Amino acid sequence: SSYQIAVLAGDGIGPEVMAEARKVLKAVEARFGLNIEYTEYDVGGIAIDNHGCPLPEATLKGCEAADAVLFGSVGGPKWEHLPPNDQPERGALLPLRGHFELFCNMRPAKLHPGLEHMSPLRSDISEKGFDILCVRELTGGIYFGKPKGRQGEGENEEAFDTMRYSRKEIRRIAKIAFESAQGRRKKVTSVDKANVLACSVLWREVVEEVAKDYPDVELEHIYIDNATMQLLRRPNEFDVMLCSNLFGDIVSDEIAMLTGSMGLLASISMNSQGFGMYEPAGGSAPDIAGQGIANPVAQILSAALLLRHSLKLEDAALAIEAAVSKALNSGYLTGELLSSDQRHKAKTTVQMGDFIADAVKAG
Amino acid sequence: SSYQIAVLAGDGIGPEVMAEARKVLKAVEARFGLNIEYTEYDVGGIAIDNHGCPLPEATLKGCEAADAVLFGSVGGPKWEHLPPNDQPERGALLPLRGHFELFCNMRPAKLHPGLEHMSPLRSDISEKGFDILCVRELTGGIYFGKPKGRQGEGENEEAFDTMRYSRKEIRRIAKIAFESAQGRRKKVTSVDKANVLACSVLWREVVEEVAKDYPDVELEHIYIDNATMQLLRRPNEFDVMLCSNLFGDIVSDEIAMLTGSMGLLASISMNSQGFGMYEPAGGSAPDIAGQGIANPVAQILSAALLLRHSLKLEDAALAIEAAVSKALNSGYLTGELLSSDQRHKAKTTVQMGDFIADAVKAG
Ligand SMILES: CC(C)[C@H](C(=O)O)[C@@H](O)C(=O)O
Ligand SMILES: CC(C)[C@H](C(=O)O)[C@@H](O)C(=O)O
Ligand SMILES: [Cl-]
Ligand SMILES: [Cl-]
Ligand SMILES: [Mg+2]
Ligand SMILES: [Mg+2]
């Protein structure tokens, strides 16, 4: 029968980049003979506007019915005044990850051939290339530990957060990182702060337990502060990074910016049953919404990753990725990936999606 | 009467860079007429070897008697096998900061004129320069919060750490950052994760309270993940960074590596009474110990910062800083700051300290 995908475009540039993803997906469906049905739901600011909250119960029910979620991005100035709790990102993302038990986040990032000069790294460093998959534990640690809150008053008012991890939680995310490394370059770098945090001591211990089953994968451990330095100096030496929730938030961002090409980057958030949400690493960029200049590649690649990881449609995911590569390598670029003297030749969001969709067809 | 300085050279390159600092200090004492008495104590690995622990009670008593501590660096492979608890860094640094209530850490970092090309940043970014003072809260947050430890067994064995901050703790570190900014470029960027952590919500709240007293200082807040990205893209736009304990550990390291010149960088750790410990940001670098090639500038500048901050000897601190600048600007460089084709002309650790000491004298 039909695959089912819930589409949660969100705010800002979400809807316009989503239209291009839907356009490429349709080419893929025709080429591979796939029956996929789509249903659309509000989330983030458009959900606050139509329903009073950023994650409506009907949107949760709709995601629950689907095999995966193709997600855009949420947030905008319209909602920034609200309490931390009621806002599009915190109010939709954290509840979605807890609700669907999405303990696995994967952010692939590489310098694409021919676009290494976009990196903010010195040219002798960026020309060496890099390709780093960040595996981040997404439903544990300090994001969801209890107790959390505040007590007390005046100068003695105090807040607290609790970072907690169990062996079962660390084992499952570490297995993902070692499995991923087996299909890449067989190296995992686990990022922790084991000279300070009890949680990191246990993290490092359990990752060493898991690593016994993968002797052909090199394991190394690095402290979070040093990691931010070593990603500047030698990013070509890392393959998979394995991080807790807070340290993976930080490392994946630094690596994303090291690409210089964040409009290409996508994010996988998956549970143990293979259900997942797939979305650009970049945000809703409300400053360019509706101008038709946003780079749709991150949203289109989020759809390829949805086909590979949730639907196990490997050839279909490969086809989208090949088509994107063709556009980038043929220099068919949106404006943020061009120099100021070439920027007048930027391709629009629609031109990009048209090229990519045509390439999937042409086979 | 005499000022009193406890000298804790530590392991690896500590003693050799310390000899150069002592050499410059002696020039300064003669030029400014200062009476300073020094006493030496073991800490870190040499203290483990002579006394069985990395922070002997007699070393604590000796620091307590002194007006400030000129500290080297601790750690080495000889001690890496030991339990996390018993090792030179964790065992000496964390106890020293708690013991002496050193809640204020300050790490100044700039691209020095004429050495911008050392940065790992693209040349169009590094040539714009940067000068960023990181103010890091050093005795609170998750480093020292309780409860911390583990319970449970097998797959349900779990560890925990607690991040805690009070209004009094945030106020005092924030005042340092705003005062510092008043004498610099009047901008504080406070780094937090207030979309996730209760402690960051309170941090941001208290920093806004403190900021009312300094309306001529620009305040902005940035999330830790985004900060690691924005330091790559626009480091010339930051002046003072104000961070909690874990986020300041991370941001100061990334900025240090962005200099490309970590052998120049020093660290201030101070209590509310003006007592402090002053040390290189870089480590004991056991791989080059005794080879007489280590760059002593970080240790020598740690002594200038000891004179300015603990002893309020502003002209003496200025003199050391001018003398260092003279060496760097005259191209009198140790090897790690030279290209491979010029590296044969590296100056030794002693040559550096001699030049700098002579410059202080020459006035
Ligand atoms: C919005 C925020 C809660 C979120 C997180 O911290 O995970 C974001 O930074 C991310 O990386 O997806
Ligand atoms: C050694 C470690 C405990 C220490 C810290 O985390 O503060 C170090 O990274 C530092 O920055 O001084
Ligand atoms: Cl965490
Ligand atoms: Cl902290
Ligand atoms: Mg993030
Ligand atoms: Mg550190």
Coordinates of N, CA and C in Angstrom, one line a residue, chain A residues 147-270:
Chain A
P147 N 15.3 17.0 38.4 CA 14.6 18.2 38.5 C 15.1 19.4 37.7
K148 N 14.2 20.2 37.2 CA 14.6 21.5 36.6 C 13.7 22.5 37.0
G149 N 14.2 23.7 37.3 CA 13.2 24.8 37.7 C 14.0 25.8 38.6
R150 N 13.2 26.5 39.5 CA 13.9 27.4 40.3 C 13.3 27.5 41.7
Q151 N 14.0 27.9 42.6 CA 13.4 28.2 44.0 C 14.1 29.4 44.6
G152 N 13.5 29.9 45.7 CA 14.3 30.8 46.5 C 13.9 32.2 46.1
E153 N 14.5 33.2 46.8 CA 14.2 34.6 46.3 C 15.3 35.6 46.6
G154 N 15.2 36.7 45.8 CA 16.1 37.8 45.9 C 17.5 37.2 45.4
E155 N 18.6 37.7 46.1 CA 19.9 37.2 45.7 C 20.1 35.7 45.9
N156 N 19.3 35.0 46.7 CA 19.4 33.6 46.8 C 18.4 32.8 45.9
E157 N 17.7 33.5 45.0 CA 16.9 32.8 44.0 C 17.9 32.0 43.2
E158 N 17.5 30.7 42.9 CA 18.5 29.9 42.2 C 17.7 29.0 41.2
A159 N 18.4 28.7 40.1 CA 17.8 27.8 39.1 C 18.7 26.6 39.1
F160 N 18.0 25.5 38.6 CA 18.7 24.2 38.4 C 18.3 23.5 37.2
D161 N 19.2 22.7 36.7 CA 19.0 21.8 35.6 C 19.7 20.5 35.9
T162 N 19.2 19.4 35.5 CA 19.9 18.1 35.8 C 20.2 17.4 34.5
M163 N 21.5 17.0 34.4 CA 21.9 16.2 33.2 C 21.9 14.8 33.7
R164 N 21.2 13.9 33.0 CA 21.1 12.5 33.4 C 21.3 11.6 32.2
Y165 N 22.1 10.5 32.3 CA 22.2 9.5 31.2 C 22.3 8.1 31.9
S166 N 21.6 7.2 31.2 CA 21.7 5.7 31.6 C 22.6 5.0 30.6
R167 N 23.1 3.9 31.0 CA 23.8 3.0 30.1 C 22.9 2.6 28.9
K168 N 21.6 2.3 29.1 CA 20.7 2.0 27.9 C 20.7 3.2 26.9
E169 N 20.6 4.4 27.4 CA 20.5 5.6 26.5 C 21.8 5.8 25.8
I170 N 22.9 5.6 26.5 CA 24.2 5.8 25.8 C 24.4 4.7 24.7
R171 N 24.1 3.4 25.1 CA 24.4 2.3 24.2 C 23.7 2.5 22.9
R172 N 22.4 2.9 22.9 CA 21.7 2.9 21.7 C 22.2 3.9 20.6
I173 N 22.5 5.1 21.2 CA 23.1 6.2 20.3 C 24.5 5.8 19.9
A174 N 25.3 5.2 20.8 CA 26.6 4.8 20.3 C 26.6 3.7 19.2
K175 N 25.7 2.8 19.3 CA 25.5 1.8 18.3 C 25.3 2.4 16.9
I176 N 24.5 3.5 16.9 CA 24.2 4.2 15.7 C 25.5 4.8 15.1
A177 N 26.3 5.3 16.0 CA 27.5 6.0 15.5 C 28.5 5.0 15.0
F178 N 28.5 3.8 15.6 CA 29.6 2.8 15.1 C 29.0 2.2 13.8
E179 N 27.7 1.9 13.8 CA 27.2 1.4 12.5 C 27.4 2.4 11.4
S180 N 27.2 3.7 11.7 CA 27.3 4.7 10.6 C 28.8 4.7 10.2
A181 N 29.7 4.7 11.2 CA 31.1 4.7 10.9 C 31.6 3.5 10.0
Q182 N 31.0 2.3 10.3 CA 31.3 1.1 9.4 C 31.0 1.4 8.0
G183 N 30.0 2.2 7.6 CA 29.7 2.4 6.2 C 30.4 3.6 5.7
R184 N 31.2 4.3 6.5 CA 31.9 5.5 6.1 C 33.4 5.2 6.2
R185 N 34.2 5.8 7.1 CA 35.6 5.7 7.1 C 36.1 4.9 8.4
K186 N 35.1 4.3 9.1 CA 35.4 3.5 10.3 C 36.2 4.3 11.4
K187 N 35.7 5.5 11.7 CA 36.3 6.2 12.8 C 35.1 6.9 13.6
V188 N 35.1 6.7 14.9 CA 34.1 7.5 15.8 C 35.0 8.3 16.7
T189 N 34.7 9.7 16.8 CA 35.2 10.6 17.8 C 34.1 10.9 18.7
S190 N 34.2 10.5 20.0 CA 33.1 10.7 21.0 C 33.6 11.9 21.8
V191 N 32.6 12.9 21.9 CA 32.9 14.2 22.5 C 32.2 14.2 23.8
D192 N 33.0 14.5 24.9 CA 32.5 14.6 26.2 C 33.2 15.6 27.1
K193 N 32.8 15.6 28.4 CA 33.6 16.4 29.3 C 34.0 15.5 30.6
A194 N 34.7 14.4 30.3 CA 34.7 13.3 31.4 C 35.7 13.7 32.4
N195 N 36.4 14.9 32.3 CA 37.3 15.4 33.4 C 36.5 16.2 34.4
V196 N 35.2 16.4 34.1 CA 34.3 17.2 35.0 C 33.0 16.6 35.3
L197 N 32.3 16.0 34.3 CA 30.9 15.5 34.5 C 30.8 14.0 34.7
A198 N 30.1 13.7 35.8 CA 29.7 12.3 36.0 C 29.0 11.6 34.8
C199 N 28.2 12.5 34.2 CA 27.5 11.9 32.9 C 28.5 11.6 31.8
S200 N 29.6 12.4 31.7 CA 30.6 12.1 30.7 C 31.5 10.9 31.0
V201 N 31.7 10.7 32.4 CA 32.5 9.5 32.7 C 31.7 8.3 32.3
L202 N 30.4 8.3 32.7 CA 29.6 7.1 32.2 C 29.5 7.0 30.7
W203 N 29.3 8.2 30.0 CA 29.3 8.2 28.5 C 30.5 7.5 28.0
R204 N 31.7 7.9 28.4 CA 33.0 7.4 27.9 C 33.1 5.9 28.1
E205 N 32.7 5.5 29.4 CA 32.7 4.0 29.8 C 31.8 3.2 28.9
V206 N 30.6 3.6 28.7 CA 29.6 2.8 27.8 C 30.1 2.9 26.4
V207 N 30.6 4.0 25.9 CA 31.1 4.0 24.5 C 32.2 3.0 24.3
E208 N 33.1 2.9 25.3 CA 34.2 1.9 25.3 C 33.5 0.5 25.3
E209 N 32.4 0.2 26.0 CA 31.8 -1.1 26.0 C 31.3 -1.5 24.6
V210 N 30.6 -0.5 24.0 CA 30.0 -0.7 22.7 C 31.1 -0.9 21.7
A211 N 32.2 -0.2 21.8 CA 33.3 -0.2 20.8 C 33.9 -1.7 20.7
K212 N 33.8 -2.4 21.8 CA 34.3 -3.8 21.7 C 33.7 -4.6 20.6
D213 N 32.5 -4.3 20.2 CA 31.9 -5.1 19.1 C 32.3 -4.7 17.7
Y214 N 33.1 -3.6 17.6 CA 33.4 -2.9 16.3 C 35.0 -2.7 16.4
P215 N 35.8 -3.8 16.5 CA 37.3 -3.5 16.6 C 37.9 -2.9 15.4
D216 N 37.2 -3.0 14.2 CA 37.7 -2.4 13.0 C 37.3 -0.9 12.8
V217 N 36.7 -0.3 13.9 CA 36.3 1.1 13.9 C 37.3 1.8 14.9
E218 N 38.0 2.7 14.5 CA 38.9 3.5 15.4 C 38.0 4.4 16.4
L219 N 38.3 4.3 17.7 CA 37.5 5.2 18.7 C 38.5 6.2 19.2
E220 N 38.1 7.4 19.3 CA 38.9 8.3 20.1 C 37.9 9.2 20.9
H221 N 38.4 9.7 22.0 CA 37.6 10.6 22.8 C 38.2 12.0 22.8
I222 N 37.4 13.0 22.8 CA 37.9 14.3 22.8 C 37.0 15.2 23.8
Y223 N 37.6 16.1 24.5 CA 36.8 17.0 25.4 C 36.2 18.1 24.5
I224 N 34.9 18.5 24.9 CA 34.2 19.4 24.1 C 34.9 20.7 23.8
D225 N 35.7 21.3 24.8 CA 36.4 22.5 24.5 C 37.4 22.3 23.4
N226 N 38.3 21.3 23.6 CA 39.3 20.9 22.6 C 38.6 20.6 21.3
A227 N 37.5 19.9 21.3 CA 36.8 19.6 20.0 C 36.6 20.9 19.2
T228 N 36.2 22.0 19.8 CA 35.9 23.2 19.1 C 37.1 23.7 18.4
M229 N 38.3 23.5 19.1 CA 39.5 23.9 18.5 C 40.0 23.0 17.4
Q230 N 39.9 21.7 17.6 CA 40.4 20.7 16.6 C 39.6 20.6 15.3
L231 N 38.3 20.9 15.4 CA 37.5 21.1 14.2 C 38.0 22.3 13.3
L232 N 38.6 23.3 13.9 CA 39.3 24.4 13.1 C 40.5 24.0 12.4
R233 N 41.3 23.2 13.1 CA 42.7 22.9 12.7 C 42.8 21.7 11.7
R234 N 41.9 20.7 11.9 CA 42.1 19.4 11.2 C 40.7 18.8 10.9
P235 N 39.8 19.5 10.4 CA 38.5 18.8 10.2 C 38.5 17.7 9.2
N236 N 39.5 17.6 8.3 CA 39.6 16.4 7.4 C 39.9 15.2 8.2
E237 N 40.2 15.2 9.5 CA 40.5 14.0 10.2 C 39.4 13.4 11.0
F238 N 38.2 14.0 10.9 CA 37.0 13.4 11.6 C 36.1 12.7 10.6
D239 N 35.4 11.7 11.1 CA 34.5 10.9 10.3 C 33.2 10.9 10.9
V240 N 32.9 10.1 11.9 CA 31.7 10.3 12.7 C 32.0 10.9 14.1
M241 N 31.1 11.9 14.5 CA 31.2 12.4 15.9 C 30.1 11.9 16.6
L242 N 30.3 11.5 17.8 CA 29.3 10.9 18.7 C 29.2 11.8 20.0
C243 N 28.0 12.4 20.2 CA 27.9 13.4 21.2 C 26.6 13.3 22.0
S244 N 26.7 13.7 23.3 CA 25.4 13.9 24.0 C 24.5 15.0 23.5
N245 N 23.4 15.3 24.2 CA 22.4 16.2 23.6 C 23.1 17.6 23.6
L246 N 23.6 18.2 24.7 CA 24.1 19.5 24.6 C 25.4 19.6 23.8
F247 N 26.3 18.6 23.9 CA 27.5 18.8 23.2 C 27.3 18.6 21.7
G248 N 26.3 17.7 21.3 CA 25.9 17.6 19.9 C 25.3 18.8 19.3
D249 N 24.5 19.5 20.0 CA 23.9 20.8 19.6 C 25.0 21.7 19.1
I250 N 26.1 21.8 20.0 CA 27.2 22.7 19.8 C 28.2 22.3 18.7
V251 N 28.6 21.0 18.7 CA 29.5 20.6 17.7 C 28.9 20.6 16.3
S252 N 27.6 20.2 16.2 CA 27.0 20.2 14.8 C 26.9 21.6 14.2
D253 N 26.6 22.6 15.1 CA 26.6 24.0 14.6 C 27.9 24.4 14.1
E254 N 29.0 24.2 15.0 CA 30.3 24.7 14.5 C 30.6 24.1 13.1
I255 N 30.4 22.7 13.0 CA 30.8 22.1 11.7 C 29.9 22.7 10.6
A256 N 28.6 22.9 10.8 CA 27.8 23.5 9.8 C 28.3 24.8 9.3
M257 N 28.7 25.6 10.2 CA 29.3 26.9 9.8 C 30.7 26.8 9.1
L258 N 31.4 25.8 9.5 CA 32.7 25.5 8.8 C 32.5 25.1 7.3
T259 N 31.3 24.6 7.0 CA 31.0 24.4 5.5 C 30.9 25.7 4.7
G260 N 30.5 26.7 5.4 CA 30.2 27.9 4.6 C 29.0 27.8 3.7
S261 N 28.3 26.7 3.8 CA 27.2 26.3 2.9 C 25.9 25.7 3.6
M262 N 25.4 26.5 4.6 CA 24.4 25.9 5.5 C 23.1 25.6 4.7
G263 N 22.9 26.3 3.6 CA 21.6 26.0 2.9 C 21.6 24.7 2.2
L264 N 22.7 23.9 2.3 CA 22.7 22.5 1.7 C 22.4 21.5 2.8
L265 N 22.4 21.9 4.1 CA 22.5 20.9 5.2 C 21.2 20.4 5.8
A266 N 21.1 19.1 6.0 CA 19.8 18.6 6.5 C 20.0 17.8 7.8
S267 N 18.9 17.5 8.5 CA 18.9 16.9 9.8 C 17.9 15.7 9.9
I268 N 18.4 14.6 10.4 CA 17.5 13.4 10.6 C 17.3 13.3 12.1
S269 N 16.0 13.1 12.5 CA 15.7 12.8 13.9 C 14.8 11.6 13.9
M270 N 15.3 10.5 14.5 CA 14.7 9.1 14.3 C 14.4 8.4 15.7

